[PDB]
């Protein structure tokens, strides 16, 4: 195991909970991984796959993303920041996209499931880009209770960066619906204590976080430094307790650890 191996593992000793990370550098494809192969509960990071889904549709469907849906009272879940100032009205699958993704809305991710056919359906689009890791199996908010060992709504960090990675900076989607995840992500409102705390201020990163029961707090993001291929960095963090606190302060540890270690 490397040095950037050994202070992961002991900021993990440190914190004490569990760590996933994973690291991939554009520039020659190599990977970092620190229990890469380990399921985490997603929580909140499983609305990228959502989000892009819906993106997918919209390259046959070409004004999917401005089709109105109504918000609905009985719609409404336990966070719902955007969504709550449109009751009564609608918002569009855009908007939606967008709510969820910036704001980690969860009756936006509820609505971008229902457009799905699912949590099924978002996990058909996983499948659909090779991610064969990725289980989505429950609607907002219950897919956040992180239970230890539980497989519902897990992937794995190797998995969710190779993912991320495609989505962002691959090909998997159309170039329109690609720079639209880009700046999204890029515009993400939750993440200053996470992954981006811990990264040269000069780099320009989007991310997505979560967080859930067991403590759970977790990023994902890509990043774009200077003069060098841009990173894709996944950050997965759970906890023994039911009712432990959020430590976004270990997701950027983690990315420091990497940042310096590149
Ligand atoms: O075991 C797995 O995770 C993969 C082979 C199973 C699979 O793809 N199932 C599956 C995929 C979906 F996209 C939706 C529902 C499902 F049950
Ligand atoms: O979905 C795929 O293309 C890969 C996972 C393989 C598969 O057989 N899928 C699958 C299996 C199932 F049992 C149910 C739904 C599915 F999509
Ligand atoms: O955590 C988030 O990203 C926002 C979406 C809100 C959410 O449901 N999180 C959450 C759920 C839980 F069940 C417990 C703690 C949490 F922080």
């Not at 000793?13 to 520039?27: E, F, N, P, Q």
């Not at 109105?68 to 920041?81: F, S």
């Not at 700046?183 to 990264?199: D, E, F, P, Q, Y």
């Not at 890509?222 to 997701?251: C, H, K, M």
Request: charged content about 20%.
């Amino acid at each position: 195991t490397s040095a950037v191996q050994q202070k992961l593992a002991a900021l993990e000793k440190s914190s004490g909970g569990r760590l996933g990370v994973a690291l991939i550098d554009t520039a020659d494809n190599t990977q970092v991984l620190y229990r890469g192969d380990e399921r985490f509960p997603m929580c909140s990071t499983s609305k990228v796959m959502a989000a892009a889904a819906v993106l997918k549709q919209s390259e046959t469907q070409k004004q999917l993303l401005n089709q109105p849906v109504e918000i609905k009272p009985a719609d409404l879940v336990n966070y719902n920041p955007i969504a709550e100032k449109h009751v009564n009205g609608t918002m569009t699958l855009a908007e939606l996209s967008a709510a969820a993704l910036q704001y980690s809305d969860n009756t936006a991710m509820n609505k971008l499931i229902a457009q799905l056919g699912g949590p099924g359906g978002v996990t058909a689009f996983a499948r659909a880009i090779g991610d064969e890791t990725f289980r989505l199996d429950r609607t907002e908010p219950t897919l956040n209770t992180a239970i230890p060992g539980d497989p519902r709504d897990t992937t794995t960090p190797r998995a969710m960066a190779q993912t991320l990675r495609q989505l962002t900076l691959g090909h998997a989607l159309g170039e329109t619906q690609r720079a639209q995840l880009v700046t999204w992500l890029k515009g993400n409102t939750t993440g200053a204590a996470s992954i981006r705390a811990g990264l040269p201020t000069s780099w320009t990163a989007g991310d997505k976080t979560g967080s859930g029961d067991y403590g759970t707090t977790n990023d994902i993001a890509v990043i774009w430094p200077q003069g060098r291929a841009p990173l894709v960095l996944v950050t997965y963090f759970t906890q023994p307790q039911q009712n432990a606190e959020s430590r976004r302060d270990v997701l950027a540890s983690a990315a420091r650890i990497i940042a310096e270690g590149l």
